[PDB]
Design a protein around this ligand. Sequence first.
Ligand SMILES: CCCCCCCCCCCCCCCCCC(=O)OC[C@H](COP(=O)([O-])OCC(O)COP(=O)([O-])OC[C@@H](COC(=O)CCCCCCCCCCCCCCCCC)OC(=O)CCCCCCCCCCCCCCCCC)OC(=O)CCCCCCCCCCCCCCCCC
Ligand SMILES: CCCCCCCCCCCCCCCCCC(=O)OC[C@H](COP(=O)([O-])OCC(O)COP(=O)([O-])OC[C@@H](COC(=O)CCCCCCCCCCCCCCCCC)OC(=O)CCCCCCCCCCCCCCCCC)OC(=O)CCCCCCCCCCCCCCCCC
Ligand SMILES: CCCCCCCCCCCCCCCCCC(=O)OC[C@H](COP(=O)([O-])OCC(O)COP(=O)([O-])OC[C@@H](COC(=O)CCCCCCCCCCCCCCCCC)OC(=O)CCCCCCCCCCCCCCCCC)OC(=O)CCCCCCCCCCCCCCCCC
Ligand SMILES: CCCCCCCCCCCCCCCCCC(=O)OC[C@H](COP(=O)([O-])OCC(O)COP(=O)([O-])OC[C@@H](COC(=O)CCCCCCCCCCCCCCCCC)OC(=O)CCCCCCCCCCCCCCCCC)OC(=O)CCCCCCCCCCCCCCCCC
Ligand SMILES: CCCCCCCCCCCCCCCCCC(=O)OC[C@H](COP(=O)([O-])OCC(O)COP(=O)([O-])OC[C@@H](COC(=O)CCCCCCCCCCCCCCCCC)OC(=O)CCCCCCCCCCCCCCCCC)OC(=O)CCCCCCCCCCCCCCCCC
Ligand SMILES: CCCCCCCCCCCCCCCCCC(=O)OC[C@H](COP(=O)([O-])OCC[N+](C)(C)C)OC(=O)CCCCCCCCCCCCCCCCC
Ligand SMILES: CCCCCCCC/C=C/CCCCCCCC(=O)OC[C@H](COP(=O)(O)OCCN)OC(=O)CCCCCCC/C=C/CCCCCCCC
Ligand SMILES: CCCCCCCCCCCCO[C@@H]1O[C@H](CO)[C@@H](O[C@H]2O[C@H](CO)[C@@H](O)[C@H](O)[C@H]2O)[C@H](O)[C@H]1O
Lengths: 80, 103, 135, 139, 383, 53, 62, 57
Amino acid sequence: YNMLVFRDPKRRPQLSEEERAKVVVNQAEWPEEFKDFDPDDPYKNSPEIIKGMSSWNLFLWGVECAFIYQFYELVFPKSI
Amino acid sequence: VYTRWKCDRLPVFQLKLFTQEYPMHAAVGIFTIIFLWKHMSHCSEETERKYGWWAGYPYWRDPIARRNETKYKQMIINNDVDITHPKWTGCSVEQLEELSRVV
Amino acid sequence: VLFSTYRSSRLVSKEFLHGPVMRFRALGEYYFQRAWNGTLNWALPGEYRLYAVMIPFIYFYHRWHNDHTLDRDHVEKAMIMRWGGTLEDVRKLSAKDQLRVRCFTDIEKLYSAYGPKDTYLQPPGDTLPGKDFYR
Amino acid sequence: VGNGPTFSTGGECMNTCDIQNAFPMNDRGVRSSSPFQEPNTAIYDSYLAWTYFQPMDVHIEKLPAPEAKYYQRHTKKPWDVSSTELTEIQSRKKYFQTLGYLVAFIYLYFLMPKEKSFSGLSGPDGHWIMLPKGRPELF
Amino acid sequence: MQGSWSVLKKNCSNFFPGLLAFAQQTQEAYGIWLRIYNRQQKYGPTDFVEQSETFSPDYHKRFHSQDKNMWVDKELCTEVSQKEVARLMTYKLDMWRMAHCAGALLATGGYAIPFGLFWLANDTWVPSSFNLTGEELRAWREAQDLYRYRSAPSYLTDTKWHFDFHAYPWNETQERAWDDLFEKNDVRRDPKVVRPAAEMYDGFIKFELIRRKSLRHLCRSMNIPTFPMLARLCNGTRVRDYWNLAWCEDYMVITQRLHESMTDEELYDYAWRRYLAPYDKNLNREQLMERVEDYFEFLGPDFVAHGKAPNLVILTNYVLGYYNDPAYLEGDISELDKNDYDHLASWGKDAFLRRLEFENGPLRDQVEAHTQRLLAERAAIAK
Amino acid sequence: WCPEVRDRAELEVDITGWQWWSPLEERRLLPVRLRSVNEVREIMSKTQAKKSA
Amino acid sequence: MLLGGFVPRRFSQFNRDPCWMFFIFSVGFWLGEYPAMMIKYNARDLVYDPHRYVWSHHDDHH
Amino acid sequence: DIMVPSFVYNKLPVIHFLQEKRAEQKLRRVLDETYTEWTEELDQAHVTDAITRSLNI
Ligand SMILES: CCCCCCCCCCCCCCCCCC(=O)OC[C@H](COP(=O)([O-])OCC(O)COP(=O)([O-])OC[C@@H](COC(=O)CCCCCCCCCCCCCCCCC)OC(=O)CCCCCCCCCCCCCCCCC)OC(=O)CCCCCCCCCCCCCCCCC
Ligand SMILES: CCCCCCCCCCCCCCCCCC(=O)OC[C@H](COP(=O)([O-])OCC(O)COP(=O)([O-])OC[C@@H](COC(=O)CCCCCCCCCCCCCCCCC)OC(=O)CCCCCCCCCCCCCCCCC)OC(=O)CCCCCCCCCCCCCCCCC
Ligand SMILES: CCCCCCCCCCCCCCCCCC(=O)OC[C@H](COP(=O)([O-])OCC(O)COP(=O)([O-])OC[C@@H](COC(=O)CCCCCCCCCCCCCCCCC)OC(=O)CCCCCCCCCCCCCCCCC)OC(=O)CCCCCCCCCCCCCCCCC
Ligand SMILES: CCCCCCCCCCCCCCCCCC(=O)OC[C@H](COP(=O)([O-])OCC(O)COP(=O)([O-])OC[C@@H](COC(=O)CCCCCCCCCCCCCCCCC)OC(=O)CCCCCCCCCCCCCCCCC)OC(=O)CCCCCCCCCCCCCCCCC
Ligand SMILES: CCCCCCCCCCCCCCCCCC(=O)OC[C@H](COP(=O)([O-])OCC(O)COP(=O)([O-])OC[C@@H](COC(=O)CCCCCCCCCCCCCCCCC)OC(=O)CCCCCCCCCCCCCCCCC)OC(=O)CCCCCCCCCCCCCCCCC
Ligand SMILES: CCCCCCCCCCCCCCCCCC(=O)OC[C@H](COP(=O)([O-])OCC[N+](C)(C)C)OC(=O)CCCCCCCCCCCCCCCCC
Ligand SMILES: CCCCCCCC/C=C/CCCCCCCC(=O)OC[C@H](COP(=O)(O)OCCN)OC(=O)CCCCCCC/C=C/CCCCCCCC
Ligand SMILES: CCCCCCCCCCCCO[C@@H]1O[C@H](CO)[C@@H](O[C@H]2O[C@H](CO)[C@@H](O)[C@H](O)[C@H]2O)[C@H](O)[C@H]1O
């Protein structure tokens, strides 16, 4: 997948079909972060850096910073 | 083993690089620098007023005039110049006094 | 004899400021020393996060400098020329008036070449002051 | 296993580079990213393909330590500086340079006033230098 | 060698005695050179006397030709002895350095004095005559050997890299000769195995086509002053003269077997002037004789038969190979038990690093199989 | 801990040898490998025959 | 060279990496400064400078 | 600080590989020069025959 011009790297298969079919998958040994792993969304279960901090919260934080930058003088104007 | 870039200090490596690696380039660079500072290192007052200021020349305070005034005052005070000499004024001191009494 | 030409002539001990230097190197190496961080002539790295972080920071500091140091000169010139031609005349106004003038200047900047031309061309019959108002 | 880096690759796929033969090939057919032998080397396909080696805990039969006579060469010279010492020196120098550049960047983009301001409230308007002093005969 | 206050005091104390000794050596060497020059002009070949012009095939730049512009005087023993030739060579080195210093003094007037202080603080560029005792001479020789060690590896690497990147040997014997020519001094090189490299390089580059940078490196390795280098045909002339004298002396010794009767110190000096025996190695007479015989064998029978030495470039590389010490390695093997990236441990692994470890870790096969099966199922569903 | 490689690389770069590929030397040395026992037997037989001749 | 690195699959994942957190904050600033300009510069109470015809950049540069 | 280090780093692998091949070549040449020498010694039968001639048998 892509995010603008950033493309997610994909690991090339190394095992042949014959060898691959003989592999036994045991997700019990897999880490909790990567279970039901999906190449199209590998970070779905990845933990948040800050608990309770959503992406939309940061976006709104940036919007509020922009609003402050544009409106601060309207409330506290200063002389030349 | 010895290598210029790894063993020599920065000034020494710089001298070696521009003396035994790129000497012609350094020579031409010095030539061009001399030319630039000999023929492209002056700016008249009118040129500064036209293009020398970011937003334009602030005629309401004329900073160039103040700069020149400070320059000339410093020169006169330090060099002990008699600005009343006839050469500066084109007339004798007595004539200057007569003019002052007239005007 | 006075100064050594060889870099091996150490001036400090090997352990001088070891901790801070190691922390600095840790900061440098964590994201850059990776296989996927293949630079193009040392200028364009391969790590996406490097772009994501540095582009906003560069833009932010450049914009702050431009707004508070460069455009301020034009704004002050407009305020001075349009309201007496002297700094004291502008200072005779209140902060709110200066805010109004500066926001009008921002309006002009946003309009530029596609905005209405009545912002700087006085229509005939207009009662507002002309160019010779203060002359 | 640790999170440390490895031998740098420059974002090159060693299975197609011009010096591919210098990189050993493993059983899976993936050439190593380093002169060493790597069992778990892989290739990832972004816009451009790149080889990657993931460090892992692996035990290798360690030959007993030889004597210092058969591997130490005491040919050091006054000008010789080891790679480790060079790394230390450069790390310290770049730390100091980074601090200096940070200070300079802060001062330039947040404190330094632009010269020749229209209002005259900030920055210098310039002045003359090298003016004569104590040379009355000059005039 | 770096400058020191002790060496500065040594040279300052012996400055005027050194100058007087240099003047006496100048008179003696002028006499010797007058004899040699008269003999060359009288009995020299027409090409050598007339200084026949040899131009490069690409830019037609003149340079000395080994075959034509170099001549071995087989009958020089009648007029000049071997010791006189060695004295002349040593004086040529000392006179070159003194001439450079005097030129600097004349050029810069009295402003060269601090640079003279820098000069006297190091034995690298002071004449041998400035040493009035055995210990001082030993220190001076150590400084010269240090300069040779500093300079030679660069010349060797330049030659080897240029040839190996722009050409390859023709046959297996030439390949072996080329590979064994540039071995470190710790091992002994068989001159017979290495000789064909001379012909190979003659095919690649002769002494008449030597590049200016390579010439500068060679002059550095031969303790010949290089500043101002100027055109390549000046230091080239110096090198040609020095090696011509060396070849004359070598022919004399080989014909008269003087080296066998030569004493230990004189033999060591003879090897040193050939860049074969560093003083810091503390070689014995057996090793010196072995190296000298190897040098003679490398010269080959044709040298005695006709006075034609092998290619001068390859000869210089071979002789200077004795200064190519093995790369230094200091420190116990136990040091390899440490870790280099401990300072990063506190950082841990981010999401991408965890993903990479999971995919390429011991569970890599299982993850690959699961991913491929999922992709195949999705593709089948799509169709 | 691999001094020869370090020294050679540094010297090559310091003498204007920026390129990192050596196709000719590799071609000369690419097929080099330790011989098999049978190859050793054949070579020893050849050497013995040469010495006998 | 754009070879690799963490790539969030969608908006909700931008909080899974500090660098992308800063990136989304910056994007929020960028996109939210526009509505602020719309509100501020199209306000009812905004009034053109009465002396706007006294001086303008057009006469100055001309 | 930047360029020469990067090019040295790029050089390292090829040089390492070539030096390994050179060492293997040296070992191979060392092995190839080993031959078992078989010496021939005068058969004692002739000595016995000469002894008989001295015995005048
Ligand atoms: C004690 C020092 C030595 C004293 C003298 C010793 C004895 C004589 C020496 C040789 C004299 C040569 C005479 C000329 C030969 C022919 C060339 C020629 O035509 O020359 C024209 C003219 C000389 O005039 P003239 O024709 O002889 O007679 C007067 C004419 O009537 C004028 O007519 P005009 O119309 O040509 O006049 C226009 C103008 C024309 O003037 C120019 O165009 C000036 C050109 C300057 C060239 C500089 C060359 C070196 C460049 C190195 C690389 C720099 C890279 C960029 C760096 C930028 C950032 C710093 O002329 C002048 O005003 C001449 C003033 C020259 C002042 C030189 C000052 C050099 C400062 C270098 C600073 C380096 C900073 C590095 C910091 C690094 C820190 C990490 O300019 C020059 O010769 C320029 C070169 C001078 C070299 C002097 C010797 C080396 C430098 C010694 C001083 C070092 C100071 C360091 C300060 C550091 C502060 C931090
Ligand atoms: C006062 C005015 C000053 C003017 C400004 C000067 C500025 C400084 C520039 C340098 C001047 C010379 C400095 C003294 C050097 C010592 C004498 C000498 O030549 O030694 C032999 C030696 C010759 O070297 P080579 O490579 O063996 O020669 C190859 C030939 O095939 C060799 O031929 P070969 O293989 O057949 O062997 C022959 C050999 C056989 O002999 C021997 O083996 C016996 C030893 C003889 C040489 C002994 C040299 C001793 C040197 C040390 C002296 C004591 C120093 C004490 C210092 C401490 C004092 C307290 O004898 C020779 O070496 C004879 C060489 C030919 C004569 C050269 C002299 C010509 C100028 C003098 C006459 C001027 C007349 C003016 C008339 C005016 C009319 C209006 O000299 C050198 O080492 C070369 C000079 C190295 C520095 C070069 C620096 C650049 C020069 C560029 C000059 C460009 C033109 C001028 C304008 C400059 C504007 C930028
Ligand atoms: C009484 C005695 C007997 C009588 C006299 C006899 C004759 C004597 C004279 C002849 C002697 C010849 C032999 C000399 C051997 C020694 C040479 C030498 O220097 O060796 C390095 C020597 C150390 O040698 P060493 O330790 O033995 O190591 C030797 C090794 O073998 C290392 O060897 P290496 O090969 O690696 O080193 C070579 C290195 C040599 O270089 C160096 O090593 C660099 C030396 C300087 C380094 C400075 C570093 C420190 C900088 C400090 C900056 C200031 C800091 C702040 C100060 C604040 C003060 C308040 O590189 C070079 O050779 C490069 C040559 C560059 C040639 C440039 C040519 C330019 C031509 C221009 C173009 C023309 C084109 C044609 C145009 C035509 C137009 C018509 O360096 C020093 O001792 C450094 C001294 C630093 C002094 C303090 C800093 C400068 C102070 C300036 C004061 C200014 C006062 C006035 C100011 C006025 C303002 C208005
Ligand atoms: C991070 C920033 C750090 C700070 C940075 C500072 C700013 C730097 C910015 C610019 C840097 C690059 C500049 C490049 C310029 C262009 C160079 C170029 O095109 O060169 C081509 C070319 C390259 O040279 P090369 O022969 O191929 O080999 C160069 C290698 O470096 C040879 O290497 P090698 O390994 O083959 O040889 C090693 C060894 C081999 O050993 C030897 O060769 C034996 C010892 C030889 C001793 C010297 C013999 C000289 C014989 C006479 C030469 C001709 C004289 C002509 C007449 C006099 C003209 C002045 O030689 C040496 O150790 C040489 C020792 C030289 C020490 C002096 C170096 C300069 C230090 C500063 C002192 C002057 C400061 C003045 C300003 C301040 C005043 C207050 O230059 C020449 O052909 C050389 C011509 C030299 C003519 C004389 C100098 C003329 C310039 C004006 C002198 C003014 C003197 C003022 C005295 C004081 C007055 C108050
Ligand atoms: C502070 C001092 C300032 C000094 C400034 C003055 C300049 C620097 C001075 C000297 C600096 C030291 C280093 C110089 C370079 C050394 C080169 C070198 O290593 O040569 C080795 C070399 C020795 O090697 P070799 O194996 O014995 O022989 C070389 C082989 O033949 C080689 O074999 P090959 O196979 O290579 O053969 C080719 C070779 C053949 O040549 C040679 O090697 C033979 C020697 C050179 C002959 C040059 C004369 C040729 C005939 C001229 C005819 C002119 C007629 C005009 C009539 C006009 C009537 C109105 O080269 C050529 O073919 C070149 C021919 C020259 C072409 C010149 C083109 C100029 C174009 C001008 C463009 C426009 C300019 C501006 C506009 C002007 C007009 C408005 O040296 C020489 O042979 C002669 C060296 C002479 C050095 C220069 C002496 C300088 C004297 C200065 C006196 C005046 C001082 C003024 C001071 C002012 C106040 C400060
Ligand atoms: C709004 C207007 C816009 C106009 C734009 C015009 C274009 C401007 C482009 C500028 C940028 C690009 C510059 C490129 C470089 C140009 C170089 C150039 O033409 O410069 C020439 C100029 C000419 O020098 P000059 O102007 O001093 O000439 C003197 C001539 N007289 C005395 C007759 C007036 O060179 C220099 O500026 C450097 C001179 C010093 C360095 C050279 C010294 C050695 C000279 C050797 C010969 C003479 C001495 C004898 C031999 C030596 C003895 C020791
Ligand atoms: C050369 C001076 C001759 C006259 C004597 C002046 C003595 C002045 C008193 C000095 C006291 C302090 C000395 C401290 C140690 C200085 C050591 C030194 O010079 O090292 C240089 C060292 C760099 O060395 P490296 O290139 O890394 O390697 C050196 C090994 N080759 O430089 C430094 O770090 C700077 C040190 C500056 C110390 C102060 C020097 C003052 C010199 C003044 C000279 C002028 C005359 C003074 C007269 C004073 C009368 C009371
Ligand atoms: C400032 C200038 C400094 C110059 C420094 C160097 C000076 C060198 C001087 C050398 C003088 C040699 O002396 C000279 O030698 C040559 C060669 O033997 C002699 O030459 C003689 O024999 C040769 C060889 O048979 C004949 O070709 C020649 O026709 C004949 O004259 C000269 O008759 C003699 O005068």
